[PDB]
Design a protein around this nucleic acid. Structure first.
Length: 147
RNA sequence: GGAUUGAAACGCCAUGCUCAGGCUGGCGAGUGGGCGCCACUCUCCAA
């Protein structure tokens, strides 16, 4: 509920529980070396970002999406980007999906603006038609169309 | 003729859009109007 949705109670990104996944005679996490404090750091950061109290998380389809910058109010409006369609690093975007007890990365972007017009823009421009009344609204919501 | 974090790795097994329902009841192409007014087969040729 308060973490990655649909995954096991405790999940991990790195794990080598089965022999088929080992190589060169290594074993366990030693199969990929990382300093202990470094491992702690990013895990804590990821846990923090997952906290619902901080408005930097959103669920789309099956994948949970997390983003961060020095400010987040505009990107947070992507909530309507699907719910009701219309110095610091800027807008890292990460989307991951859950396996049974381990996580996988779906996509990864670092672009600015946050534009998704590639599909939405095409989607809307395909729907263009002159209206009948003068008081109609240009951008109908999917709910209205389906109804 | 050692070693491309490599060498091997099926999305797979299978399931009815079914059972049934009147385009009906009914309505005037109907009322009425002149093909009329008038005009030379007529001049001459043995059997």
């Amino acid at each position: 509920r308060d973490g990655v949705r649909g995954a096991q109670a405790v999940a991990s990104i790195v794990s080598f529980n089965n022999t088929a996944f080992e190589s060169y005679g290594k074993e366990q996490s030693i199969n990929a070396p990382v300093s202990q404090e470094a491992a702690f750091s990013y895990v804590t950061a990821l846990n923090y970002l997952l906290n619902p109290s901080n408005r930097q998380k959103v669920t789309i389809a099956d994948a949970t999406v997390v983003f961060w910058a020095e400010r987040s109010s505009p990107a947070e409006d992507i909530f309507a980007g699907m719910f009701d369609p219309p110095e610091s690093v800027r807008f890292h975007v990460l989307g991951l999906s859950p396996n049974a007890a381990r996580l996988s990365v779906r996509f990864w972007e670092v672009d600015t603006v946050g534009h998704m017009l590639d599909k939405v823009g095409r989607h809307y421009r395909e729907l263009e038609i002159i209206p009948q009344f003068n008081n109609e609204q240009e951008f109908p919501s999917l709910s209205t169309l389906l109804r």
